Amino acid sequence: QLKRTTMRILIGLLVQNPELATLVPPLENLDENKLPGLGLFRELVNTCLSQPGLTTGQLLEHYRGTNNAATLEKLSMWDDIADKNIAEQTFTDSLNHMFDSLLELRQEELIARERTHGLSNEERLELWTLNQELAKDIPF
Numbered sequence: 001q002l003k004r005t006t007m008r009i010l011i012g013l014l015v016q017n018p019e020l021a022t023l024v025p026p027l028e029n030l031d032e033n034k035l036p037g038l039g040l041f042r043e044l045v046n047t048c049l050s051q052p053g054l055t056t057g058q059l060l061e062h063y064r065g066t067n068n069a070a071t072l073e074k075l076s077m078w079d080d081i082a083d084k085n086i087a088e089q090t091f092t093d094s095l096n097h098m099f100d101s102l103l104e105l106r107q108e109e110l111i112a113r114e115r116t117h118g119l120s121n122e123e124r125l126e127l128w129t130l131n132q133e134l135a136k137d138i139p140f
């Protein structure tokens with residue numbers, strides 16, 4: 001009866017449909033500490049890209065023995081996301097929500113940085129840009 005969250009959907013859908021990994025943009029320069037589940041998601045995407053065509057069982061086997069194995073097992077049997085017809089649309093929708101979340105975190109970071117240290121011209125333009133566009137047992 002797992003409740004839906006952005007990272008649960010992304011990781012769950014990827015485990016159940018590893019071919020979805022090809023839809024993910026490069027995540028190399030993201031800070032996994034800013035978003036629970038992001039580090040795991042990025043690991044899974046890299047595994048899938050390393051072995052095109054791998055099945056769900058082959059993906060889960062690669063992660064046997066890791067500290068996330070039990071969580072991926074649960075997401076692999078999570079039938080709330082099991083529908084194949086809407087899987088891809090749900091994946092790309094949730095991808096955008098994840099990056100939306102990172103935008104909101106960055107805006108909050110720049111606001112805090114502005115009070116404590118002030119902003120550079122580049123950072124102040126970034127904050128202005130964010131303000132305009134943002135106005136318009138599983139641990140994640």
Ligand SMILES: [Zn+2]
Pocket residue numbers: 047062
């Ligand atoms: Zn590996």
Ligand SMILES: [Zn+2]
Pocket residue numbers: 093094097
């Ligand atoms: Zn949406």
